[PDB]
Design a protein around this ligand. Structure first.
Ligand SMILES: [Ca+2]
Ligand SMILES: [Ca+2]
Ligand SMILES: [Ca+2]
Length: 154
């Protein structure tokens, strides 16, 4: 969704051309996107470049685009076989290259936590859709998020 107009119009409830923090909270909660207020605030603070307390469409778009390049490099960092998809063994080996060692079952837990549809594996579109509003900037903070999200070791 790389123009992001639909998302923005979805969030701009009063249709004034900007998204306020309230609209972000109410909108994300109404769209069934589970996000904490401090993290939403992280998004807003990173995005609000002119610091007027509002997110115009170009700040919104810029944030989402840069965030999606960070997420694409993270995804390709996790993608070993270059298929365009992520399997559990790949989570295991990618984590093993980082010095972390995790079981296959915990890897399964991670994939299931990340996966929002029934695919049982995660392609670029699902990865991007999942981390769309998650203010993580790279793979290490993605790991920190996993560590809180699954409530598992490392
Ligand atoms: Ca608005
Ligand atoms: Ca602004
Ligand atoms: Ca794979």
């Amino acid at each position: 969704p790389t123009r992001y107009e639909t998302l923005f119009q979805a969030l701009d409830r009063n249709g004034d051309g900007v998204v306020d923090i309230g609209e972000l909270q109410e909108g994300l909660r109404n769209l069934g996107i589970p996000l904490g207020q401090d993290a939403e605030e992280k998004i807003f603070t990173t995005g609000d470049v002119n610091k007027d307390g509002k997110l115009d469409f170009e700040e919104f778009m810029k944030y989402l685009k840069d965030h999606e390049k960070k997420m694409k490099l993270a995804f390709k960092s996790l993608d070993k076989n270059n298929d365009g998809k992520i399997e559990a063994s790949e989570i295991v080996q990618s984590l093993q290259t980082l010095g972390l060692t995790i079981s296959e079952q915990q890897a399964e837990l991670i994939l299931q936590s990340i996966d929002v549809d029934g695919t049982m594996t995660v392609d670029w579109n699902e990865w991007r859709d999942y981390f769309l509003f998650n203010p993580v900037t790279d793979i290490e903070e993605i790991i920190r998020f996993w560590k809180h999200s699954t409530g598992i070791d490392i």
